[PDB]
Design a protein around this ligand. Structure first.
Ligand code: CA
Lengths: 44, 43, 44, 43
């Protein structure tokens, strides 16, 4: 009734979190590319 | 459950926003990757 | 009631579509890194 | 009623198996970027 209706708000709030740990992993990921790129422009 | 329904949606449209920036960013990632990779092929 | 209640399953169907794009994109990069990784060792 | 609310929760936990496979996948990218970035720092 309402009790699965939070087995819904609950699971979800855990999805925003899981999403956020992802974005900052995208960022870590990018950082390492910009840099790794810059070492290649220069090693030339 | 009428107004928590309402909350649920709001939070969902927020969750797509996020899944969107993610999607943008992977596109960028992938081009840098190919860009990076081309140069390894030049040298 | 049911109105807002599918402005919900609507989102989810759309959410999971995107979670599918990424997983295949991710798949693409994972083997572009492997290509670059393989070569660096060659360029050595 | 409960019928569609039941669906809702399903495809939601479906998405958590997904994003979980995904993190496990961007982790494995990150290890390759480190390891790639280390290898140049040497040449
Ligand atoms: Ca990535």
């Amino acid at each position: 009734i309402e009790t699965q209706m939070d087995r819904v708000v609950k699971e979800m709030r855990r999805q925003l979190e899981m999403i956020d740990k992802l974005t900052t992993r995208e960022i870590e990921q990018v950082e390492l590319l910009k840099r790794i790129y810059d070492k290649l422009t220069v090693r030339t």
